[PDB]
Amino acid sequence: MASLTEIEHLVQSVCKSYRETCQLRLEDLLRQRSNIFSREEVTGYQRKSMWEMWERCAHHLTEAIQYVVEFAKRLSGFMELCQNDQIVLLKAGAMEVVLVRMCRAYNADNRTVFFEGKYGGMELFRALGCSELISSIFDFSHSLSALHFSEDEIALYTALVLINAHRPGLQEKRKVEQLQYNLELAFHHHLCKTHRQSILAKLPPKGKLRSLCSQHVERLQIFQHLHPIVVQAAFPPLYKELFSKILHRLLQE
Numbered sequence: 001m002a003s004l005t006e007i008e009h010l011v012q013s014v015c016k017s018y019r020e021t022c023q024l025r026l027e028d029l030l031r032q033r034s035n036i037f038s039r040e041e042v043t044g045y046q047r048k049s050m051w052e053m054w055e056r057c058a059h060h061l062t063e064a065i066q067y068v069v070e071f072a073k074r075l076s077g078f079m080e081l082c083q084n085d086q087i088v089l090l091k092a093g094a095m096e097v098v099l100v101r102m103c104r105a106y107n108a109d110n111r112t113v114f115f116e117g118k119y120g121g122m123e124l125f126r127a128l129g130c131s132e133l134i135s136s137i138f139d140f141s142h143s144l145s146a147l148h149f150s151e152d153e154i155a156l157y158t159a160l161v162l163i164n165a166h167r168p169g170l171q172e173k174r175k176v177e178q179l180q181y182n183l184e185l186a187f188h189h190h191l192c193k194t195h196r197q198s199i200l201a202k203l204p205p206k207g208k209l210r211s212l213c214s215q216h217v218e219r220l221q222i223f224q225h226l227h228p229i230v231v232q233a234a235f236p237p238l239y240k241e242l243f244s245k246i247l248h249r250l251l252q253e
């Protein structure tokens, strides 16, 4: 199944769907690189209460996830899977897709990430009380930055992050397997064509993205146990549904 021309057509539609849902164009993020938070602004963030920082981050992550949901809806083959399988793939892979896309907003030269209009270092997030997770995210972004991914590579890699036939709970495993296989052929064909197959051995293990996501769910549990009404009253409904329906409504539109 799937000939060379169909594989190349899949590459183009995956890259197109990603450009339409990339949230911020690469040039927009790169243009802001010398716009860095001052010492006074960093201090201001560290002095914010733990629950105010958690609400702001949950809000920014929710916006990012919304673009990942739209990417999935435009992704060739995804809307043809059943609703249960669409939701199983998004619940397990939306945050993983966000963590990979995040490397585009990371500047390896000074170890800063784009957040609320400017670039700031890891110390900006000290008030969350989850410094091991924040450093793990910055390390992961640094490791992805060393690969120098093109926008097309990001599009193809993130399509495979989401289209994972091994997620527990899939009702039509074969359908997800066939779609994952075509996306993998598209990704490997594009790397072979561009002389970039050397990135394959440098891509992170599947367990690394899973550990970052498990750490996020665990740190959220600790926060929620301490501040339950903050989560109930001020966290985005989509965020709570995924990590603590909205997804069904988002996919139906």
Ligand SMILES: COc1ncc(Oc2c(Cl)cc(NC(=O)CC3CCN(S(C)(=O)=O)CC3)cc2Cl)cc1C(C)C
Pocket (backbone or CB within 6 Å): 022, 023, 024, 025, 029, 054, 056, 057, 058, 060, 061, 064, 101, 102, 103, 104, 105, 113, 114, 115, 116, 125, 128, 130, 133, 134, 137, 216, 219
């Ligand atoms: C997992 O838990 C987390 N992941 C990241 C966290 O910190 C952030 C947040 Cl919340 C946002 C940004 N940045 C943005 O949201 C801006 C965004 C960057 C990505 N681009 S993009 C997709 O165009 O490249 C769009 C703009 C960066 C970091 Cl470190 C916090 C958490 C938990 C512990 C709460």
